[PDB]
Amino acid sequence: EQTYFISGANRGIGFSVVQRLAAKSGVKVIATARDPASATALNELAKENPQVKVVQLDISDEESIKKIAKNVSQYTDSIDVFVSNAAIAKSFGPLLNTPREQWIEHFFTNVLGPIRLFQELYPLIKKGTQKKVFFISSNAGSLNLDFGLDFSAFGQSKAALNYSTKELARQLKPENFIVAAVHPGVVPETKITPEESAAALCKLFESLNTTGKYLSYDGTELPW
Amino acid sequence: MEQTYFISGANRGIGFSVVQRLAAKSGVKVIATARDPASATALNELAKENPQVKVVQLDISDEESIKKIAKNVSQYTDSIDVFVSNAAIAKSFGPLLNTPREQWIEHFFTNVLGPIRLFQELYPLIKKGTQKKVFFISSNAGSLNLDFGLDFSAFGQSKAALNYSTKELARQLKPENFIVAAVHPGVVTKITPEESAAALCKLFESLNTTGKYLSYDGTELPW
Ligand SMILES: NC(=O)C1=CN([C@@H]2O[C@H](COP(=O)(O)OP(=O)(O)OC[C@H]3O[C@@H](n4cnc5c(N)ncnc54)[C@H](OP(=O)(O)O)[C@@H]3O)[C@@H](O)[C@H]2O)C=CC1
Ligand SMILES: NC(=O)C1=CN([C@@H]2O[C@H](COP(=O)(O)OP(=O)(O)OC[C@H]3O[C@@H](n4cnc5c(N)ncnc54)[C@H](OP(=O)(O)O)[C@@H]3O)[C@@H](O)[C@H]2O)C=CC1
Numbered sequence: 001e002q003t004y005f006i007s008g009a010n011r012g013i014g015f016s017v018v019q020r021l022a023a024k025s026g027v028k029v030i031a032t033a034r035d036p037a038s039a040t041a042l043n044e045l046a047k048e049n050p051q052v053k054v055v056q057l058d059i060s061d062e063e064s065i066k067k068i069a070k071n072v073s074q075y076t077d078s079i080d081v082f083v084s085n086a087a088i089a090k091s092f093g094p095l096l097n098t099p100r101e102q103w104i105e106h107f108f109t110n111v112l113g114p115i116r117l118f119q120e121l122y123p124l125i126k127k128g129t130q131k132k133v134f135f136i137s138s139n140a141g142s143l144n145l146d147f148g149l150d151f152s153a154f155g156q157s158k159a160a161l162n163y164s165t166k167e168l169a170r171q172l173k174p175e176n177f178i179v180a181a182v183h184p185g186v187v188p189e190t191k192i193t194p195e196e197s198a199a200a201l202c203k204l205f206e207s208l209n210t211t212g213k214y215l216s217y218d219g220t221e222l223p224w
Numbered sequence: 225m226e227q228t229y230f231i232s233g234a235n236r237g238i239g240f241s242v243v244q245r246l247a248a249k250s251g252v253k254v255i256a257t258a259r260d261p262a263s264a265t266a267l268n269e270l271a272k273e274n275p276q277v278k279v280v281q282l283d284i285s286d287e288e289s290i291k292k293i294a295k296n297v298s299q300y301t302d303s304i305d306v307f308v309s310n311a312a313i314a315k316s317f318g319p320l321l322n323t324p325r326e327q328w329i330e331h332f333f334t335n336v337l338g339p340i341r342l343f344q345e346l347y348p349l350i351k352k353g354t355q356k357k358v359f360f361i362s363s364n365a366g367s368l369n370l371d372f373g374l375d376f377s378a379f380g381q382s383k384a385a386l387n388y389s390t391k392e393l394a395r396q397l398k399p400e401n402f403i404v405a406a407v408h409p410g411v412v413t414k415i416t417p418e419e420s421a422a423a424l425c426k427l428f429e430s431l432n433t434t435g436k437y438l439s440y441d442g443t444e445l446p447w
């Protein structure tokens with residue numbers, strides 16, 4: 001058996017990933033939503049496949065993250081594959097035109113949120129077998145790619161989390177953790193369906209055997 | 225031919241040494257900032273002896289202080305030739321699991337948001353200037369592609385985040401002929417603050433291309 005944990009599972013790639021794991025035999029899935037009672041798709045998913053466990057998480061709300069270890073501990077003794085998926089993407093374009101609020105929100109939600117989530121869930125991951133850790137990042141997060149676009153707070157936040165992911169990989173290598181930053185695709189770079197992003201992500205999540213990688217969905221490396 | 229320099233965090237360290245180096249140059253006006261100017265003893269004495277050195281208050285962690293910096297600089301000058309975001313903190317190193325919430329937050333507000341907001345407030349003054357030079361004092365520890373065998377935690381993450389946004393800014397302001405750089409001032413193989421300041425002032429004067437990540441000697445660093 002393997003416990004997978006996915007934040008932001010109510011819709012998007014996160015829902016598509018949970019949908020797909022719900023298929024795989026002997027897979028337990030802790031799936032989070034900000035508002036589980038409005039998570040119509042995902043409550044139905046869990047009712048048909050009750051190995052899918054639904055759980056409250058707002059990654060922008062420290063009081064929500066302060067409860068995530070108990071909330072997950074209701075359903076499991078461990079986590080094999082942690083996925084920080086929940087995230088926002090609200091501000092793009094020039095720096096002179098990006099207000100304080102946008103920088104602050106992208107930091108708390110996209111950088112602090114995941115770091116606090118991993119910190120809270122590290123004890124549970126440490127007791128698991130696979131010790132796999134996936135921050136859903138973005139290719140716009142690279143300090144060494146040029147898309148001919150500005151990503152403002154969005155890009156900054158993905159780069160900030162990339163930096164810390166890189167360090168965390170170094171830091172946990174001794175404990176045989178597999179730590180990766182992963183660009184899931186776009187759902188101009190070719191867009192893919194959420195179910196396509198999910199399928200490639202599930203494959204990467206099972207295939208990846210080395211730490212400190214920055215991966216695109218298809219398994220090819222990106223520059224940091 | 226007169227040039228105005230803006231230096232955040234001028235009360236001590238590299239900042240003090242840069243203002244001290246600039247104070248020696250003819251036709252260079254220096255707007256030097258301190259969180260608490262009344263206790264900025266060395267800086268106030270420099271300003272007492274060299275009237276081309278103007279001391280203004282700035283806390284870059286504080287929106288209310290940032291909201292005032294443009295009007296306050298404007299009393300002492302109509303333009304900025306060279307903008308130097310030097311003020312910053314370095315209080316968080318070591319492993320992610322030992323780094324509490326408040327170190328991430330403080331390094332974000334002081335080292336990312338502050339420099340960003342400070343540039344936004346002071347851009348009009350810089351546009352009106354001749355040199356249009358914009359330096360963010362960063363760190364080689366912020367590179368995504370250097371390995372020092374050290375964990376830089378919130379310090380390192382904040383310099384990476386400022387580096388990403390600096391590089392974007394260099395693209396955005398290329399059409400207005402701004403020069404934007406992120407600059408590692410050295411470790412103060414260690415050097416002295418005065419050595420760092422000598423090298424940085426050479427660099428500020430010579431850099432004629434935007435979007436570079438540089439060390440104090442003018443050699444390039446990878447982002
Ligand atoms: N897909 C793309 O085009 C690209 C996206 N990415 C990454 O892929 C992921 C995108 O996921 P996807 O579901 O497809 O995106 P969506 O924009 O469709 O939704 C984001 C998800 O995160 C949740 N969420 C947002 N804010 C919070 C919060 N503060 N607390 C908790 N949950 C929150 C949303 O829940 P709610 O219903 O409450 O809003 C939702 O489940 C992110 O990690 C993103 O960084 C990176 C590269 C490109
Ligand atoms: N080894 C090194 O020297 C390295 C340093 N750097 C960078 O060099 C720069 C300066 O370093 P150094 O001179 O040695 O630093 P010091 O610690 O000696 O001095 C830091 C300066 O920043 C000011 N500052 C701190 N917080 C604030 C704030 N909230 N508002 C306004 N000013 C503030 C300090 O003011 P106060 O006295 O009031 O606290 C002081 O003037 C920084 O940008 C730092 O990131 C990066 C790479 C390596």
Ligand SMILES: O=C1C=C2C(=CCO[C@@H]2O)O1
Nearest residue numbers: 089092138140149151154
């Ligand atoms: O330019 C972009 C980048 C993204 C986007 C949508 C939200 O996710 C990507 O960050 O528009």
Ligand SMILES: O=C1C=C2C(=CCO[C@@H]2O)O1
Nearest residue numbers: 060061062104105108109
């Ligand atoms: O998105 C955000 C922004 C903040 C937050 C919580 C702590 O206060 C921050 O402004 O979540």
Ligand SMILES: O=C1C=C2C(=CCO[C@@H]2O)O1
Nearest residue numbers: 285286329330331333334
């Ligand atoms: O150093 C900081 C930290 C904060 C701040 C302003 C807004 O609240 C943050 O805690 O400056």
